[PDB]
Amino acid sequence: ERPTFYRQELNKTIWEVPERYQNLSPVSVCAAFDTKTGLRVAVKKLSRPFQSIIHAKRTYRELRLLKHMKHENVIGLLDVFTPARSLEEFNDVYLVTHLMGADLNNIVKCQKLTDDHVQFLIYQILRGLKYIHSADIIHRDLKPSNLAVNEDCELKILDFGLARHTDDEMTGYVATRWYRAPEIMLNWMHYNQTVDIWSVGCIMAELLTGRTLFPGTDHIDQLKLILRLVGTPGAELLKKISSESARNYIQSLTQMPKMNFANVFIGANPLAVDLLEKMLVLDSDKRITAAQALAHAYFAQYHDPDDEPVADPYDQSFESRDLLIDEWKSLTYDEVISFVPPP
Numbered sequence: 001e002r003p004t005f006y007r008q009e010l011n012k013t014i015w016e017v018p019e020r021y022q023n024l025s026p027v028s029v030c031a032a033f034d035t036k037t038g039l040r041v042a043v044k045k046l047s048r049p050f051q052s053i054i055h056a057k058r059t060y061r062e063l064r065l066l067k068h069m070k071h072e073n074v075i076g077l078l079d080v081f082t083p084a085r086s087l088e089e090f091n092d093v094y095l096v097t098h099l100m101g102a103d104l105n106n107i108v109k110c111q112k113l114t115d116d117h118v119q120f121l122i123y124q125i126l127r128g129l130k131y132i133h134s135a136d137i138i139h140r141d142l143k144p145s146n147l148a149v150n151e152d153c154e155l156k157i158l159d160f161g162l163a164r165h166t167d168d169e170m171t172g173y174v175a176t177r178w179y180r181a182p183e184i185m186l187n188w189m190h191y192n193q194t195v196d197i198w199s200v201g202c203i204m205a206e207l208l209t210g211r212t213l214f215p216g217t218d219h220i221d222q223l224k225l226i227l228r229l230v231g232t233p234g235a236e237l238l239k240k241i242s243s244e245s246a247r248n249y250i251q252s253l254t255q256m257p258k259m260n261f262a263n264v265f266i267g268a269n270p271l272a273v274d275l276l277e278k279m280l281v282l283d284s285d286k287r288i289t290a291a292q293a294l295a296h297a298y299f300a301q302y303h304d305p306d307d308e309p310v311a312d313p314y315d316q317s318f319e320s321r322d323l324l325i326d327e328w329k330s331l332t333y334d335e336v337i338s339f340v341p342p343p
């Protein structure tokens with residue numbers, strides 16, 4: 001039952017993988033050919049997955065998330081393996097997924113798309129988001145670089161459970177921050193699923209115009225760009241900013257009304273403008289949800305309420321648990337050896 005493994009050094013790291021995977025090429029992630037399925041695959045070798053409690057829990061988190069996702073528009077797990085033959089030997093985890101053709105950041109850089117492509121790409125993101133949000137999974141980091149497409153314009157959402165960004169990585173004129181909802185960028189309040197809809201709005205705007213919507217040079221500049229478009233917060237939203245210091249700062253800004261989005265997105269389909277106004281609402285309680293957006297008339301060409309499935313429940317009670325490294329490692333090992341490949 002255990003396959004035979006073979007070893008290869010690739011950019012100064014030993015990769016040990018079942019024989020079915022051939023033509024490993026660095027892209028740590030390698031592209032490869034799964035001779036058993038005929039699929040072009042991406043293979044991620046986790047770096048030192050059990051070196052600390054925080055790392056061991058992150059390894060378990062990523063594997064739990066990838067094992068759960070079973071949806072056309074979300075990256076799922078084709079395989080997971082370790083060369084270890086016992087829990088005692090277990091120190092390496094490899095994750096195998098479909099290899100997509102390219103990501104939106106690489107394909108659509110500086111380019112506006114036709115309206116039909118914006119409809120189809122945003123439709124597919126929202127279909128995937130309906131699925132993940134129905135499991136109370138929040139992506140939290142949607143941006144063009146973790147949205148991948150194939151040559152048929154079919155899209156998958158990537159990168160779940162990744163290591164939380166450092167302060168330096170979120171600093172300055174950086175795409176790591178341009179798509180974040182203001183309540184998470186400035187820690188206004190406990191955030192929820194609606195943060196992902198803000199990112200979809202920023203992404204949809206950029207597909208329509210070819211331009212970053214809120215290319216802030218830093219957190220404060222970005223907030224000013226945001227509030228110029230959507231207006232400064234009103235009294236109801238201010239009360240929900242539980243961060244007293246954040247609430248006090250935003251009240252120091254001169255009040256500004258929401259702009260006319262038809263004058264910002266000149267020439268765009270009025271249905272696209274309407275949908276953007278319903279996504280890019282400052283108060284997260286009032287943003288359109290993914291399920292609601294799928295029924296918006298902008299997507300009339302694509303919407304099928306019988307083919308927009310929800311997810312099985314996802315138990316993430318482990319998130320609140322404090323365990324030892326070897327306990328996270330044992331949980332991870334159970335998930336590796338119980339993996340069942342998809343059809």
Ligand SMILES: Oc1cccc(-c2nnc(NCc3c(F)cccc3Cl)[nH]2)c1
Pocket residue numbers: 029042043044066075095096097098099100101102103145146148158159160
């Ligand atoms: O930014 C790009 C561009 C082209 C393909 C890809 C791509 N295709 N499949 C993936 N999967 C990456 C991956 C793993 F390899 C393992 C676990 C999770 C993920 Cl997202 N990435 C990403």
